[model samples]
Target: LHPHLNANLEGGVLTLAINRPEAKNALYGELYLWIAKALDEADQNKDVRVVVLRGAEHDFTAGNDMKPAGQVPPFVLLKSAARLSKPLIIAVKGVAIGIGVTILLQADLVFADNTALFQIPFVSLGLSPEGGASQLLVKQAGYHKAAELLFTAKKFNAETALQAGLVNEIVEDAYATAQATAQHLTALPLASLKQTKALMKHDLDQIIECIDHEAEIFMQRVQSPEM
Candidate 1:
């Protein structure tokens, strides 16, 4: 069993859907670590061309479950996404709060449905930004927009997210749109796509460093007198 992760590979496309629908896919650490493993493996596999992440059924995620202290594996998955040698795509529907929204920054392409809502709850939760929100989000949505998103913790719809350039496209079905895009990418030369992504992805050293720094500060703030 893969816990809350549903991973399947077909036609050279590996889709990892968050399978914890009961909590709207709100996550604990192991699931995040599992996803990291999936990405690491997919990158190494010769047959895997592209990876798409979506949630089960409708909701993408409601954000973190506010579980126990070890929120570390989310750091694992975020860094894994950052270091992916191949393209990573994400499909979003319903609520995408906290890391759910920030993780989209790591994706090469992001597709969201009209039903999608995005938020960043770090400041509200008394924790700092993680998953590259400080740098990645600013780079994606500009400094002022990113400040509004993280500071206010206001929930925003897909149209607003599109205007912010957080998502590449809005569709009736995010999963279908993302899957079709991944399938088309799968048909192309994998090496070419990887190299193209490499050519386009600048400051990766800085990106990973930012992830690490965010995780460190977040962990310190999250310590429940134990740590």
Candidate 2:
């Protein structure tokens, strides 16, 4: 149903692959909606115990496509991430830019190849961070590290990401590693996993509140003369 997203559900795992290789899986109009809907389905479906997001071998996503603004907008997907009850896992191969990097803040586990590249360049684009990344970055990377990344817009490697605690581990094959992790999670009791995930995400509501506040500022920046 989605032009750029390939979604499949099997064996208690919902795997979402970004299919637009030509554009490096850039998210376009309503694509985030498809993702949000799929996540909601996974949350309600008893058979789905885990969700895994994957992209091409060379790139997770180049971030938002410049044309045709999403009909659903990305904040819907951000909110969906905040409320997700099922375990969220991600596999990154080459490059993850913009939302690609910011979205990692919400994943329960992330696996990336040693060659993968990441960056948050919102300021360089004359836009502010979306998806509550402004606050989550500080929580994950500390004030100094987060400030440096936000201010400099520098590109970082997988090793730096691992050290920064942005990813669980770096592997030769991130997709395989993430899939294996998801399968392992699925073997556990679903209720226990759900409860544990809920407990770990107790502050999710606060993050969502931050998202709402940041989203307003983000929209203003989007329409500002500087953008």
Model 1: ten consecutive residues of lowest lDDT:
64-73
Top model by TM-score, which number? 2
lDDT of each: 0.86, 0.84
- Residue 219's lDDT within candidate 2 is 80
Candidate 1 local Cα displacement, residue 165, angstroms? 1.1
Off by over 4 Å in 1: 68-71, 223-227
| lDDT of candidate 2 over 42-93, digit per residue (tens) | 8998888899988875789888888822223788887787788989998997
Instruction: State TM-scores per candidate.
Output: 0.94, 0.95
lDDT of 2: 0.84
User: Total backbone clashes of model 2?
Assistant: 0
